Amino acid sequence: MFVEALKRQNPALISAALSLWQQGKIAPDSWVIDVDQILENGKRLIETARLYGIELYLMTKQFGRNPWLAEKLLALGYSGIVAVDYKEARVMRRAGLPVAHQGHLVQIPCHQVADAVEQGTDVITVFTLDKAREVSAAAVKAGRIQSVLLKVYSDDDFLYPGQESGFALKVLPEIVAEIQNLPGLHLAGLTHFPCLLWDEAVGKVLPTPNLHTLIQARDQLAKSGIALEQLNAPSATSCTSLPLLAQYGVTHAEPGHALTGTIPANQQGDQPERIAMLWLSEISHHFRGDSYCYGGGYYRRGHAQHALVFTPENQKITETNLKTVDDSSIDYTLPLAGEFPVSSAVVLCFRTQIFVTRSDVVLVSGIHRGEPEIVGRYDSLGNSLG
Amino acid sequence: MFVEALKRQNPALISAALSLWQQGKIAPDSWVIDVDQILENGKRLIETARLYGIELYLMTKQFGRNPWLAEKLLALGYSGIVAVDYKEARVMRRAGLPVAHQGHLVQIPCHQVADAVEQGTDVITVFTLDKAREVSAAAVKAGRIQSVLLKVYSDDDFLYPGQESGFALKVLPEIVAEIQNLPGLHLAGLTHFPCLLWDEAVGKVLPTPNLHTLIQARDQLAKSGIALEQLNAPSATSCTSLPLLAQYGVTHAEPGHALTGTIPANQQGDQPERIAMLWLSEISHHFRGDSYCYGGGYYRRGHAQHALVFTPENQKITETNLKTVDDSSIDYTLPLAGEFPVSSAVVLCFRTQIFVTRSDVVLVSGIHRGEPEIVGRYDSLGNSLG
Ligand SMILES: [Cl-]
Ligand SMILES: [Cl-]
Q: What is d(CA B280, CA B295) in angstroms, rounded to the nearest whole number?
A: 10
Q: What is d(CA A197, CA A189) in angstroms, rounded to the nearest whole number?
A: 22
Q: What is d(CA B247, CA A269) in angstroms, rounded to the nearest whole number?
A: 61
Backbone angles phi, psi at B291, to 5 degrees: -105, 150
Distance between first and last Cα of chain A: 32
Is the same domain home to B112 and B8? Answer: no
* Interface residue of B105, B113, B124, B128 to substitute, partner A, most A CBs within 10 Å: B128
Contact list in B for residue A356 (CB cut-off 8 A) is 330, 358
Say yes or no for a CB contact (<8 Å) between A128 and B286. Answer: yes
Buried residues in A344-361 as b, exposed as e (16+ CB within 10 A): bbbbbbbbbbbbbbbbbb
Q: What is d(CA B206, CA B198) in angstroms, rounded to the nearest whole number?
A: 6
Per-residue CA distances from B182 to B120, B126, B139, B226 (Å): 19, 13, 10, 15
| Residue B197 C-alpha, separation from nearest chain A C-alpha, in angstroms | 16
**Residue B30 CA, ligand 1 centroid: distance in Å:** 44
Backbone angles phi, psi at B267, to 5 degrees: -65, -20
Q: Which residue from A21, A327, A342 is facing B327, i.e. has the nearest CB?
A: A327
Residue-range definition of the domain harbouring residue B377: 2-98+254-385
Q: What is d(CA B256, CA B161) in angstroms, rounded to the nearest whole number?
A: 20
The experimental method, as deposited, was X-ray
What does DSSP say about strands B277-287 and B30-34: parallel, antiparallel, or unpaired?
Answer: antiparallel
Return the closest-CA partner of residue B359 out of B307, B293, B291, B311. B293
List B residues 109-168 in contact with A (Cβ-Cβ < 8 A): 109-112, 127-128, 130-131, 134, 160-166
Q: What is d(CA A83, CA A68) in angstroms, rounded to the nearest whole number?
A: 15
Secondary structure (H, E, C), chain B: CCHHHHHHHCHHHHHHHHHHHHCCCCCCCEEEEEHHHHHHHHHHHHHHHHHHCCEECEECHHHCCCHHHHHHHHCCCCCCEEECCHHHHHHHHHCCCCEEEECCCCCCCHHHHHHHHHHCEEEEEECCHHHHHHHHHHHHHCCCCEEEEEEEECCCCCCCCCCCCCEEHHHHHHHHHHHHHCCCEEEEEEECCCCEEEECCCCEEEECHHHHHHHHHHHHHHCCCCCCCEEECCCCCCCCCHHHHHHCCCCEECCCHHHHCCCHHHCCCCCCCCCCEEEEEEEEEEECCEEEEECCCCCCCCCCCEEEEEECCCCEEEEEEECCCCCCCCCCEEEECCCCCCCCEEEECCCCCHHHCCCEEEEEECHHHCCCEEEEEECCCCCECC
Burial, B143: exposed, middle or buried (Cβ in 10 Å; 0-12, 13-18, 19+)? exposed
Q: What is d(CA B255, CA B56) in angstroms, rounded to the nearest whole number?
A: 7
B206 strand-pairing partners: B197
Q: Are A339 and A276 in contact (CB under 8 A)?
A: no
Buried residues in A169-206 as b, exposed as e (16+ CB within 10 A): beebeebbeebeebebbebbbbbbbbbbbbeeeeeebe
Q: Are A233 and A250 in contact (CB under 8 A)?
A: yes
Q: Are A344 and A333 in contact (CB under 8 A)?
A: no
Return the closest-CA partner of residue A379 out of B294, B355, B63. B355
| Interface A:B, Cβ pairs < 8 A | 165
| Alpha-carbon torsion (B270, B276, B279, B280), positive or negative | positive
Buried residues in A112-129 as b, exposed as e (16+ CB within 10 A): bbbbbbeeebbbbbbbbb
Per-residue CA distances from A265 to A2, A238, A298 (Å): 11, 9, 21
Find how far residue A380's CA is from the centre of its chain. Answer: 13
Q: What is the CATH number of the domain that holds A36?
A: 2.40.37.30
Give the number of other Cβ atoms within 10 Å of residue A383's Cβ.
Answer: 22
Say yes or no for a CB contact (<8 Å) between B328 and A300. Answer: yes
Q: Are B308 and B347 in contact (CB under 8 A)?
A: yes
**Residue A110 CA, ligand 2 centroid: distance in Å:** 12
Return the closest-CA partner of residue B83 out of B382, B384, B362, B291. B382
Is the same domain home to A207 and A263? Answer: no
Contact list in A for residue B164 (CB cut-off 8 A) is 287-288, 292, 333, 335
Return the closest-CA partner of residue A137 out of A201, A185, A200. A185
| Residue A269 C-alpha, separation from nearest chain B C-alpha, in angstroms | 26
Secondary structure (H, E, C), chain A: CCHHHHHHHCHHHHHHHHHHHHCCCCCCCEEEEEHHHHHHHHHHHHHHHHHHCCEECEECHHHCCCHHHHHHHHCCCCCCEEECCHHHHHHHHHCCCCEEEECCCCCCCHHHHHHHHHHCEEEEEECCHHHHHHHHHHHHHCCCCEEEEEEEECCCCCCCCCCCCCEEHHHHHHHHHHHHHCCCEEEEEEECCCCEEEECCCCEEEECHHHHHHHHHHHHHHCCCCCCCEEECCCCCCCCCHHHHHHCCCCEECCCHHHHCCCHHHCCCCCCCCCCEEEEEEEEEEECCEEEEECCCCCCCCCCCEEEEEECCCCEEEEEEECCCCCCCCCCEEEECCCCCCCCEEEECCCCCHHHCCCEEEEEECHHHCCCEEEEEECCCCCECC
Last residue of a domain, one of B219, B251, B283: B251
Q: In one letter, which amino acid is B7?
A: K
Note if the bond before A335 is cis, omega within 30 degrees.
Answer: no
Find how far residue B55's CA is from the centre of its chain. Answer: 17
Task: Quote the radius of gyration of chain A (alpha carbons, Å).
Answer: 22
Burial, B129: exposed, middle or buried (Cβ in 10 Å; 0-12, 13-18, 19+)? middle
Is the same domain home to A158 and A302? Answer: no
What size, in residues, is chain A?
Answer: 386
Q: Are A82 and A58 in contact (CB under 8 A)?
A: yes
| Residue B48 C-alpha, separation from nearest chain A C-alpha, in angstroms | 30
Q: What is d(CA B76, CA B255) in angstroms, rounded to the nearest whole number?
A: 13
Q: Are A336 and A321 in contact (CB under 8 A)?
A: yes
B354 strand-pairing partners: none
Q: In one letter, which amino acid is A328?
A: S
| Total domain count, chain A | 2
List B residues 41-100 in contact with A (Cβ-Cβ < 8 A): 84-87
Say yes or no for a CB contact (<8 Å) between B128 and A331. Answer: no
Q: What is d(CA A280, CA A25) in angstroms, rounded to the nearest whole number?
A: 12
Q: In one letter, which amino acid is B257?
A: H
Instruction: List, in order, residues 6 or more apart from B309 with CB less than 8 Å away.
Output: B283, B291, B317, B318, B319, B320, B336, B340, B344, B345, B346
Backbone angles phi, psi at B18, to 5 degrees: -65, -40
Q: Are A89 and A109 in contact (CB under 8 A)?
A: no
Last residue of a domain, one of B251, B269, B299: B251
Q: What is d(CA B99, CA B120) in angstroms, rounded to the nearest whole number?
A: 7
Q: Are B84 and B106 in contact (CB under 8 A)?
A: yes
Q: What is d(CA A244, CA B199) in angstroms, rounded to the nearest whole number?
A: 57
Is the same domain home to B21 and B159? Answer: no
Is the same domain home to B108 and B235? Answer: yes
Buried residues in B330-359 as b, exposed as e (16+ CB within 10 A): bbbbbbbeeebebbbbbbbbbbbbbbbbbb
Return the closest-CA partner of residue A213 out of A156, A128, A150, A148. A156
Q: What is d(CA A339, CA A286) in angstroms, rounded to the nearest whole number?
A: 7
Q: What is d(CA A76, CA A220) in angstroms, rounded to the nearest whole number?
A: 36
Q: What is d(CA A368, CA A43) in angstroms, rounded to the nearest whole number?
A: 15
Say yes or no for a CB contact (<8 Å) between B165 and A130. Answer: no
**Residue B345 CA, ligand 2 centroid: distance in Å:** 9
Angle (nearest 5°) at CA B248 between B247 and B250: 105
Contact list in A for residue B381 (CB cut-off 8 A) is 358, 379-381, 383
Is the same domain home to B121 and B158? Answer: yes
Q: What is d(CA B200, CA B194) in angstroms, rounded to the nearest whole number?
A: 16
B343 at A interface, C-beta within 8 A = yes
Last residue of a domain, one of B201, B233, B251: B251
Which residues precede a break in chain A, with C-to-N distance above 2.5 Å? none
Say yes or no for a CB contact (<8 Å) between A333 and B110. Answer: no
Is the same domain home to A108 and A118? Answer: yes
CA dihedral B360, B361, B364, B367 (to 10 degrees): 100
Q: What is d(CA B381, CA B340) in angstroms, rounded to the nearest whole number?
A: 32
Per-residue CA distances from A80 to A93, A112, A123, A192, A255 (Å): 12, 19, 11, 19, 12
B170 at A interface, C-beta within 8 A = no
Instruction: List, in order, residues 6 or more apart from B177 with CB less than 8 Å away.
Output: none
Is the same domain home to B121 and B222? Answer: yes
Q: What is d(CA B87, CA B105) in angstroms, rounded to the nearest whole number?
A: 12
**Residue B283 CA, ligand 2 centroid: distance in Å:** 11
Q: What is d(CA A306, CA B234) in angstroms, rounded to the nearest whole number?
A: 34
Task: Quote the radius of gyration of chain B (alpha carbons, Å).
Answer: 22
Contact list in B for residue A161 (CB cut-off 8 A) is 325-326, 328-329
Q: Considering every ligand atom shown, identify the ligand nearest to the alpha carbon of residue B282 and give its number.
A: 2
| Residue A138 C-alpha, separation from nearest chain B C-alpha, in angstroms | 15
Give the number of other Cβ atoms within 10 Å of residue B81's Cβ.
Answer: 30
Is the same domain home to A104 and A243? Answer: yes
Contact list in A for residue B93 (CB cut-off 8 A) is none
Q: What is d(CA A311, CA A290) in angstroms, rounded to the nearest whole number?
A: 16
Is the same domain home to B105 and B211? Answer: yes
Is the same domain home to A244 and A261? Answer: no
Is the same domain home to A230 and A263? Answer: no
CA dihedral B110, B116, B121, B127 (to 10 degrees): 0
Q: What is d(CA B381, CA B65) in angstroms, rounded to the nearest whole number?
A: 6
Say yes or no for a CB contact (<8 Å) between B343 and A285. Answer: no
Angle (nearest 5°) at CA B210 between B207 and B214: 100
Q: What is d(CA B162, CA B184) in angstroms, rounded to the nearest whole number?
A: 29
Q: Are A353 and A66 in contact (CB under 8 A)?
A: no
Return the closest-CA partner of residue B282 out of B304, B262, B312. B312
B126 strand-pairing partners: B150
| Alpha-carbon torsion (B94, B95, B96, B97), positive or negative | negative
Backbone angles phi, psi at A197, to 5 degrees: -145, 140
Q: What is d(CA A211, CA A226) in angstroms, rounded to the nearest whole number?
A: 19
